[PDB]
Design a protein around this ligand. Structure first.
Ligand SMILES: Nc1ncnc2c1ncn2[C@@H]1O[C@H](COP(=O)(O)OP(=O)(O)OC[C@H]2O[C@H](O)[C@H](O)[C@@H]2O)[C@@H](O)[C@H]1O
Length: 248
């Protein structure tokens, strides 16, 4: 039998296309200055920050460090694999509405990908970081979008290297523009693009920091950066703490 919440979530899944970029900015701009934005940088998983924020959260959204080409990225280290194995996310990512995002991204034949985002409403989290049931599932809205594959660019088309950073910059602003458009209060962000895709965690953490200080200033209530980091140097975790000190 199908798990509770899946049908509602899949049917509410919705595609944002590149041609709606200006719609997303106007939503951000209109929402600027609405709160005293509280923000933190943590070492929790993306669904652990979500799950503790839930009971406090008017409108809770989290970012999927998604594949551009296959829902769930075809599958252990990776965060989207984590979200798919412990929630209904996959059932939403394979939905009919969502298909143009993978179809176009594959057709682009560019490691920078395109500007489609998938909005999955009320995705039920079913299991903890350790994989047993939750009391009851806890729903979270999930914004899925692919960071540019900086690794692939370096190895397959270095000529797009200078475009890497502007691409992640404008796509992040679409990411929070979707969160503003869907009127979220609590945003779970993190080391977007910084693992498999090999983006500089310094640039990523900062690019956020700029937007939460510029166009996204005050647009959200609480923004936590859940950055899992089991590497002893804690490189990703450190660059996010080091560079989000102004805002938190
Ligand atoms: N559950 C987690 N929660 C929070 N942070 C995490 C988690 N898991 C890893 N991190 C941290 O986040 C950093 C980046 O996690 P990555 O998963 O590589 O996302 P990308 O954007 O770089 O690559 C996306 C591709 O990887 C997948 O295959 C997708 O299908 C895509 O194909 C990690 O180094 C962790 O420190």
């Amino acid at each position: 039998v199908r798990l509770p919440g899946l049908a509602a979530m899949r049917q509410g899944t919705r595609l944002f296309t590149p041609e709606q970029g200006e719609d997303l900015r106007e939503a951000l701009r209109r929402r600027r200055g609405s709160f005293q934005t509280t923000c933190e940088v943590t070492s929790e998983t993306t669904f652990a920050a979500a799950r503790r924020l839930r009971e406090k959260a008017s409108a809770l959204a989290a970012l999927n460090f998604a594949s551009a080409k296959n829902p769930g990225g075809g599958f252990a280290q990776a965060q989207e694999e984590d979200l798919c194995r412990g929630s209904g996310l996959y059932f939403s990512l394979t939905s009919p509405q969502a298909e143009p995002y993978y179809a176009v991204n594959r057709q682009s034949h560019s490691a920078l990908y395109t500007d489609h985002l998938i909005y999955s409403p009320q995705v039920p989290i079913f299991r903890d970081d350790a994989g047993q049931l939750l009391p009851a599932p806890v729903p979270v809205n999930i914004i899925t979008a692919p960071a540019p594959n900086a690794g692939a660019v370096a190895q397959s088309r270095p000529e797009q290297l200078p475009q890497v950073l502007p691409t992640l910059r404008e796509r992040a602003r679409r990411v929070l523009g979707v969160a503003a458009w869907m009127e979220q209060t609590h945003l779970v962000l993190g080391a977007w693009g910084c693992g498999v895709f090999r983006n500089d965690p310094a640039g990523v953490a900062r690019t956020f920091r700029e937007l939460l200080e510029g166009e996204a200033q005050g647009a959200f209530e609480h923004v936590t950066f859940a950055v899992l980091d089991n590497h002893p140097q804690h490189p990703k975790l450190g660059a996010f703490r080091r560079e989000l000190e102004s805002l938190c």
